């Protein structure tokens, strides 16, 4: 609601937590150290 | 293009966090022991009970110290009376002890925790807040690994126990809020979790799922030495004769026993025939120093990339004898030994750290309860090290089909209650497959549910394998 993101606002919450687990995405292939492995993501989370 | 993978499809499966319920809240009653330890202050206790009274219990609280004695909790518990769970906030914001990563501290009180409710005959489930000992997913970094080894042997504890464990809470590193949001309706939930990891994005249980094998094009080679850790031991020794098929330049079966084990000689003749530059070597694994020069006596003319970490010393998994240090003395060729070869790889370029852990950490195993959290450790250490710029694959071998490191009692017992012995003729494309995928930390077990469901969730519903979907049956 756009009341319920006043208290996200007000008291100065960030909503990064992490990547969605729900939406079966795979979550290994998408880490791994080589920054330029096809596939891989580089944030390690985001407001989801 | 594929369906002989198919079979290792069948053969992969991986534990991923999904968002669970945060249990339904009930008026708990009697009292909750706040478990604990005294030396420093902790806000954890306030911020756990201002939940535990206000859900109905009063709060106790339980000093434990580290071997303090498997009998001291139970009459402490007789003392206060009738208690309807404790909650085991030792293990929060702990470091390792760096003389072993098994002789956690808490660990040990857990498990004396555990035998001390058996034996105070108090019947009640018991809980152990963790801080961040398991990830929600590789976006999360498993702060200690050794944490995990409670994981490890938690998910063992519920199939001994079912009315004395409740499970764990794990619970982010630093914050105390998510205990104060949920731990009343977690430790009350009806939902059924066993595994629980408190975030600030919700709750997570851990679930077993099926793994993946579209059998992606890239291709992991032995290029380079392969550190063989117990390669004499049938789990590194079909690895490293597979290494050898697979064209491995140059192997290094490193064991106490090498050169003086039941089967050397045959096995690095196989291995010299496959491949070439095949060593046996008697080292300890134990020591820092010993894989310290071992890894200097690696010949400068080939690099180290392949650390195939497979030793684990086994004797007995029986919670009742179950303590810290015995866990600490069974598995150290485990742990130690991974988190030495961790520490001196840190600065090598390796292609592949394999660890080999077993099921014992991934569901639970009677008669492996101390196996269990060495496999435990191994799995935090890939889950990190997947964290940083080295890869690591914690591959959880089922029961081997020739291998005495863990195919004891407790695998022929499972052999006839779900997880099958997997032929090493597919279970070595499994991590072949692991590599391709660079899985972080694979499940590889040839377990049938038709008589797993009724080895498993028999004793304790467990919430686990309700994302495998032909876990129904």
């Known amino acids: 609601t756009p009341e319920e993101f006043w208290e996200l606002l007000s008291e100065g919450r960030d909503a990064v937590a992490g990547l969605p687990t729900d939406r079966g995405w795979d979550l290994d292939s998408l880490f791994h150290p080589d920054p330029t492995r096809s596939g891989t993501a580089h944030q390690r989370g985001g407001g989801f | 293009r594929s369906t002989e993978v198919d079979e290792v499809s069948a053969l992969r499966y991986r534990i991923e966090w999904r968002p669970t319920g945060a249990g339904e809240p009930a008026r708990l009653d009697g009292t909750w022991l706040v478990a604990k330890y005294a030396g420093t202050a902790d806000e954890t206790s306030t911020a756990a009970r201002e939940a535990l009274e206000s859900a109905g219990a009063r709060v106790r609280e339980l000093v434990v110290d580290a071997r ?11 003392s206060v009376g009738e208690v ?10 702990e470091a390792e002890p760096e003389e072993a990563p098994l002789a956690l501290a808490s660990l040990a009180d857990t498990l004396s925790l555990v035998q001390a409710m058996v034996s105070a005959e108090l019947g009640c489930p018991l809980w152990t807040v963790t801080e961040s000992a398991v990830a929600t997913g590789p976006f999360e970094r498993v702060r200690n690994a ?19 464990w409740g499970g764990l809470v794990d619970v982010p590193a630093g914050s105390v809020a998510e205990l104060a949001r949920h731990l009343a309706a977690v430790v009350s939930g009806g939902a059924g979790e066993d595994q629980l990891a408190l975030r600030a994005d919700g709750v997570y249980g851990r679930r077993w799922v099926r793994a993946a094998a579209p059998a992606t094009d890239d291709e992991w080679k032995p290029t380079g030495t392969v550190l063989v850790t117990g390669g004499t031991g049938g789990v590194g020794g079909q690895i490293a004769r597979w290494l050898a098929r697979r064209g491995a330049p ?17 096995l690095v003749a196989e291995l010299e025939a496959l491949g070439a530059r095949t060593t046996v070597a008697a080292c300890d694994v134990t020591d820092r120093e010993s894989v ?5 006596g690696i010949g400068d003319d080939v690099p180290l990339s392949a650390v195939f970490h497979a030793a684990a010393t086994l004797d007995d998994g029986t919670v009742d004898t179950l303590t810290g240090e015995r866990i600490e003395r069974a598995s150290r060729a485990k742990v130690l030994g991974a988190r030495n070869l961790h520490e001196l790889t840190r600065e090598l370029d390796l292609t592949a750290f394999v660890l080999f852990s ?19 450790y191994l799995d935090g250490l890939a889950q990190q090290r997947r964290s940083d710029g080295l890869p690591a694959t914690a591959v959880a071998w089922g029961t081997w089909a020739g291998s005495g490191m863990a ?10 209650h779900g997880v099958i012995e997997m032929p090493p003729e597919t279970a070595c494309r499994a991590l072949q497959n692991a590599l391709d995928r660079a899985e972080v930390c694979p499940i590889v077990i040839d377990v049938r549910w038709d008589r797993f469901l009724l080895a498993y969730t028999a004793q304790r519903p467990t919430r686990l394998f309700d994302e495998i979907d032909d876990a129904r049956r």
């Open chain 2, 68 to 78: 303090c004695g498997r009998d001291e909790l139970a009459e402490r518990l007789r």
């Open chain 2, 84 to 93: 309807a769970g404790v909650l085991s906030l030792l293990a929060v914001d």
């Open chain 2, 146 to 164: 050794a944490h995990g080894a409670l994981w490890g042997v938690g998910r063992v504890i519920a199939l001994e126990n079912p009315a004395v």
């Open chain 2, 250 to 266: 140059h192997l290094l079966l490193v064991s106490r026993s090498g050169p003086d084990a039941d089967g050397a000689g045959e």
């Open chain 2, 292 to 296: 310290r020069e071992l890894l200097g």
């Open chain 2, 358 to 376: 077993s099921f014992a950490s991934a569901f639970g195993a009677p008669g492996l309860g101390g196996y269990a959290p060495g496999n435990a």
């Open chain 2, 407 to 416: 195919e004891g009692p407790v695998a022929d017992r499972f052999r006839r």
